[PDB]
Design a binder for these strands. Sequence first.
RNA 1: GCCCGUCGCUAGUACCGAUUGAAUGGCUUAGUGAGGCCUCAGGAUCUGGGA
RNA 2: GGACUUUUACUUUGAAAAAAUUAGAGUGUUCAAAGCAGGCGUAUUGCUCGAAUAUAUUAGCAUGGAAUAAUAGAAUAGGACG
RNA 3: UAUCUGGUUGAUCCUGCCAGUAGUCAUAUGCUUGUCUCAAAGAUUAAGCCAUGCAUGUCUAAGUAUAAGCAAUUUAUACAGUGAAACUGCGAAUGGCUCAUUAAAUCAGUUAUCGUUUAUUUGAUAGUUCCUUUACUACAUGGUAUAACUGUGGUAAUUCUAGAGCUAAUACAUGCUUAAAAUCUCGACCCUUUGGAAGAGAUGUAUUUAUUAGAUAAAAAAUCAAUGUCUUCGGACUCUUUGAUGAUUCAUAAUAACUUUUCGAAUCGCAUGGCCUUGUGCUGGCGAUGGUUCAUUCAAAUUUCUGCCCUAUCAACUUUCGAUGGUAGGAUAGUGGCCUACCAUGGUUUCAACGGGUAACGGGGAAUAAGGGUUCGAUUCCGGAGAGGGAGCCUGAGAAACGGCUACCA
Lengths: 131, 188, 260, 167, 155
Amino acid sequence: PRAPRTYSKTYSTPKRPYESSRLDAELKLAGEFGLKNKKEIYRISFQLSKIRRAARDLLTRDEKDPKRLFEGNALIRRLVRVGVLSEDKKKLDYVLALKVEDFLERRLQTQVYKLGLAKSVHHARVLITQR
Amino acid sequence: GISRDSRHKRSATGAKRAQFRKKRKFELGRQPANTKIGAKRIHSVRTRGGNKKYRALRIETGNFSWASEGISKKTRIAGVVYHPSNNELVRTNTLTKAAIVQIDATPFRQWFEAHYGQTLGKKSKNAERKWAARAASAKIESSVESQFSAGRLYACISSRPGQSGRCDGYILEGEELAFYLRRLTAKK
Amino acid sequence: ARGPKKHLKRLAAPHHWLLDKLSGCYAPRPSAGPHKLRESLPLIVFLRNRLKYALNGREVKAILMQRHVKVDGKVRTDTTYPAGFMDVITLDATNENFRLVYDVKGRFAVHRITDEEASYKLGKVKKVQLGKKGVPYVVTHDGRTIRYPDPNIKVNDTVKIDLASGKITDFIKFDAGKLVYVTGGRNLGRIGTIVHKERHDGGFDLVHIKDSLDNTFVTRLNNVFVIGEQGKPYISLPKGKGIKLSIAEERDRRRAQQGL
Amino acid sequence: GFPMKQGVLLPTRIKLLLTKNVSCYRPRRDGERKRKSVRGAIVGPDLAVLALVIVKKGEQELEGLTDTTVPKRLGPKRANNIRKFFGLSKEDDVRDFVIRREVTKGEKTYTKAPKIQRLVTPQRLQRKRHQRALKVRNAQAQREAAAEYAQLLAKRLSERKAEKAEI
Amino acid sequence: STELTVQSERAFQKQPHIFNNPKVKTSKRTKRWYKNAGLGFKTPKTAIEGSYIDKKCPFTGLVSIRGKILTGTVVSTKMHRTIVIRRAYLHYIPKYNRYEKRHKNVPVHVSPAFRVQVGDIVTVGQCRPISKTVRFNVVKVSAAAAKANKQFAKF
RNA sequence: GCCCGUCGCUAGUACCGAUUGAAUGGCUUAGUGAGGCCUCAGGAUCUGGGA
RNA sequence: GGACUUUUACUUUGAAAAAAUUAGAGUGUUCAAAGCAGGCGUAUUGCUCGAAUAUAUUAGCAUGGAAUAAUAGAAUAGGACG
RNA sequence: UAUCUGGUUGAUCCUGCCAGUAGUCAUAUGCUUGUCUCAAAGAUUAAGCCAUGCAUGUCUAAGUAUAAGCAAUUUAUACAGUGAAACUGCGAAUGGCUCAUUAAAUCAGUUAUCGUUUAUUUGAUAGUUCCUUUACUACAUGGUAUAACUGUGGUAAUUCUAGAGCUAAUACAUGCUUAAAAUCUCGACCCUUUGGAAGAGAUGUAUUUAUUAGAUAAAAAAUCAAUGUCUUCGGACUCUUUGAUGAUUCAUAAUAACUUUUCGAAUCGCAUGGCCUUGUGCUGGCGAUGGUUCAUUCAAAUUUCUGCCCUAUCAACUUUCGAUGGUAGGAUAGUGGCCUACCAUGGUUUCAACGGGUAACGGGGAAUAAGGGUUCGAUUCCGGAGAGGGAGCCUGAGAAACGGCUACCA
Ligand SMILES: [Mg+2]
Ligand SMILES: [Mg+2]
Ligand SMILES: [Mg+2]
Ligand SMILES: [Mg+2]
Ligand SMILES: [Mg+2]
Ligand SMILES: [Mg+2]
Ligand SMILES: [Mg+2]
Ligand SMILES: [Mg+2]
Ligand SMILES: [Mg+2]
Ligand SMILES: [Mg+2]
Ligand SMILES: [Mg+2]
Ligand SMILES: [Mg+2]
Ligand SMILES: [Mg+2]
Ligand SMILES: [Mg+2]
Ligand SMILES: [Mg+2]
Ligand SMILES: [Mg+2]
Ligand SMILES: [Mg+2]
Ligand SMILES: [Mg+2]
Ligand SMILES: [Mg+2]
Ligand SMILES: [Mg+2]
Ligand SMILES: [Mg+2]
Ligand SMILES: [Mg+2]
Ligand SMILES: [Mg+2]
Ligand SMILES: [Mg+2]
Ligand SMILES: [Mg+2]
Ligand SMILES: [Mg+2]
Ligand SMILES: [Mg+2]
Ligand SMILES: [Mg+2]
Ligand SMILES: [Mg+2]
Ligand SMILES: [Mg+2]
Ligand SMILES: [Mg+2]
Ligand SMILES: [Mg+2]
Ligand SMILES: [Mg+2]
Ligand SMILES: [Mg+2]
């Protein structure tokens, strides 16, 4: 009789299971940012997918419409925050662009590597997980 | 119990309805008081939420009002002579609302001749003066005055005996009296 | 189903209480009282969830039993006693007084008021009948029976009340252009004047309302509670004076006060 | 072991339906009736025990019966019941005739008496005085507010004839 | 249906507590009561002018009209003092984004102040349960007879 | 080349079918009818007509 | 306040509207699923932002429109205003 | 988040299905399994059956204590601390659980009570109780009969209890009381008028009946029967009093009576003070528990409009033994064919009635992501139903109750 503990899943899985091109394209991503799962790519492309969905929907509404202006601007400022969206491209017609690697590039494992600290992206993984 | 629900009973289409839930008490009913004449005997039934109804079974007196004379007396109830719902009530002299009864007239006579100094049918100071004031007002009514010879008057029970413990009513008069008389004899 | 329900499941509880989803299963069920269940703010909620004064529910009974807290002037000892719009909450210790009055988001506000203002309250007369012995009476939205009111007093007028004694010291008629507090619907807590009422015989008169931003909005009559002249309110209004800003407007104001 | 029950007649058993205020049944719950066996009131060889009560004594003493005499347990507690278990006329004062039961605390002999109820006392008269007071006081109160209202009305009529004479 | 007789029952028909003192010689034989139902519905003159009793009359009897006000089209005038109307209405069916003709019959009382007949359009008013099925009472006839009078012999 | 039906073998499904066949569940005629409730009586006893 | 009003569909805007769920704002639960928190100092006797918004369609209510599509009107004049 | 691929041919283009493919708050099962957090879980089949334990009891200064109970001290020789048992009160109608029944039912959104009952909480609310009304009625306060208990017992056996003997009340059952005033009916007298009068009764609330007031749609006259206030004795009446609703015979009040007569404090805790004619007089502080009526709050019951899955290998259905409507009653808390009596012949239907099926509780919602849809919801919240199956009922404000009782069936 106690409130539902709500939850959500945070990935989607490839429609076509054996697409040789997608398969390679995914591996290199892993190999680059030191992932262990295809899911770590899956998870992100899911995050991406909704954002596009949000943005797509917004764009249909009237320019200078309240919701569009409200929630659109919110979405933009939040993407900016983490550094996925660049400052110039600050108007959501571009959040509509926006590939996965942008997201990828901003993980703590990736940043810990980018400047000093790590040297190789895997050493980056191990250091983090190790306090 | 008797259950005054609608969920027995066919739908207007005439369909048969399933049983859904059992009898609740709040849709209950109870049995008729079938109140009779003579000797006080009243039982209280405990109705919803505290609250009594008084179920009269047997009664001999009631309080009866002579509307046009704007007074009411206690009289014996001589008893039931006509009933529009069911004649068994009449033959068994049963008291229910709407029943036509016979009452007594002696209290309604004593009042009248004391208030009018006229006597129905066939020397104080104030009283004389009072009586003289009234009259031109004592001119009663053919078909009510004639009932007093018989010493019995026609009255219509207006209360609910199996509910209130009372068997009260008004004397019959004018138009309505004409009605029940016609029925009484054109049935005799 | 057999009788009065004596519990209140959390989630079934009214939102404007702002009870958290987890950490229990039930919310407090507002005792029988002067205000309706679905429009009340129990003592337990107020002494704990709003004022942060007690942590335990148990501790709220401990505060209360000492006859600390007193509502509209009387002591009041029930944990779940139904406090309501316009009532007055006093703390003998801490010398604090409160009025229960609405936000704009529709919630009950924590709103400190003077020692003076706490002497009296306002009541929407909800009906006016002729009582027994021919003594006329008014009855206000918090179930007060006040015998012998002004003839000119009729239903929907609001009324000033001595608390200290039960009496009426004034009344304001429901007339085009009188300060209004909205108590229901998604215009709850908004405040503003009155333009004109739609009649509609046999159901729900409409009250066309306009505030001090030249904004407009409607509610059912029933949901309208007079409280003064434009400008002059007979009580002190909560910060923001019930004007309702757009989500944009509100966002801007909050990210306007930004520099520490 | 089933019990006799006055006024069944019958010298056999039966199973009745019993209620509150009745022999051979103590209800566990309000409005509870239980259906229980009962032995009839006519004596028969099947009885384990007959219950007898001496009415008038015989010609010689019965061992542990006429020769020994166990006292009452408790004495009068309500004011007037004391006044009658002594015959007193409400002037004698009842505080004195209340019964006193000695008792030992090893080397302390203590003494206890009831608590007379329905005792007329000053404390009670202070309350009978107050109730009476409050009715009258209120009654007069309720009249003034009434009269004060008639005023509000009667000099509202003196404004409807100051209205109807201005315009 | 009422028609004629009026004093035609086992019981004497009268309006409750409407007393005509025989002593006071009157020129109207029967004092008769009536109200204004409200919601701007004219109490027709046949209610006041009449002498029928009918306790279910919304003008001469003991019923309040409150709740729905409904208008339908008369379909049955077979039962004494109550009629049955058809309430037509089109029902919207999303998947196909179109509608279908539906209807309901609604039984309703009808005071002998009105003289209604099949085809007439009638405005009816919600009231307390009056019988097993009836929950409405007829309060204005919108119709007439549907041009009947212009249906006579040859020119 | 393809190919049709009877006839023959294995195995499976469903059909018809004496048994006026069987089973479970829902209503229900007629007969019988517990129990509490209402009511006409009753009166162990126990009091001032009542219980 | 009196005196009376041909019927409807459609569409508009609005009220009445439970929460959780859904969509979605704010907040760095170490991340996150969540949660409705939290945040500032004089961190020695306190200061303070919150706890949005949206959807909620059929039916009933309330309001604006008068295209589209029905309905009723005056021909044995028992017509219309006075 | 708008994608398809494999298989008929010698090969070809189609039709078309089978197969693949992806998800599932979608169950099982297999193998495998380290860490943080989160956390569903005997629904499906059998609303089949159930050992044993537990799940409803409850005390404030403030209803009842002579425990032959504990503690002693601290003023307490009626009682006074503390407190088992027991009475009394209140609660056990909430909760929790399940999805068997249920297809116009439930349920939802929307209505209605001018159609009702409502413990409680909150706020209002009571000068009237007696008696033919001077040799007076307990009010300084009226009656017993019971638990616990003591003691005698019965049965193999249970939350079985019998005979005897005590004693309490806010249990049971009784029963007094208060200002002034006005209005009514009677009316001894005296005296003829225009007529007037001592003094006598009656008038709390509640009940039941009958009657009347409760105006208003803008203004005026005459007359009959009673009969008000003021006379400048031909006569005048001058100001004349009105609540709510869309709507009432509404709220409220007035008359004549009615009632195995409802309520109107025989209760309890703290403090103990004023006040003079020194009566232990007369007064008096705070607040408990009550109490009738009205309001309010928690409710309840019915109720308007519209919306339900498959089915015609269900087309007519409904009135036996109520089916649809009228009159009267009875019954109910109250509307109503709810039930009865009289009377009538109606009510529903191809715009699918009525019947059947449902591996059917309804809803908020869940899953699937172009859109339109399709499928699912026993199951954390809301409503409803049930407690092995039926019916019945006691108590009570509230149950047709099942961790209540009664009967039948298993
Ligand atoms: Mg509570
Ligand atoms: Mg209304
Ligand atoms: Mg006492
Ligand atoms: Mg007929
Ligand atoms: Mg009977
Ligand atoms: Mg809309
Ligand atoms: Mg929300
Ligand atoms: Mg092949
Ligand atoms: Mg091939
Ligand atoms: Mg070849
Ligand atoms: Mg497939
Ligand atoms: Mg389960
Ligand atoms: Mg099971
Ligand atoms: Mg002691
Ligand atoms: Mg329950
Ligand atoms: Mg006795
Ligand atoms: Mg009592
Ligand atoms: Mg008049
Ligand atoms: Mg008026
Ligand atoms: Mg009345
Ligand atoms: Mg003293
Ligand atoms: Mg078939
Ligand atoms: Mg009938
Ligand atoms: Mg027939
Ligand atoms: Mg079909
Ligand atoms: Mg099922
Ligand atoms: Mg389903
Ligand atoms: Mg469900
Ligand atoms: Mg199931
Ligand atoms: Mg049940
Ligand atoms: Mg079972
Ligand atoms: Mg059966
Ligand atoms: Mg049961
Ligand atoms: Mg239970």
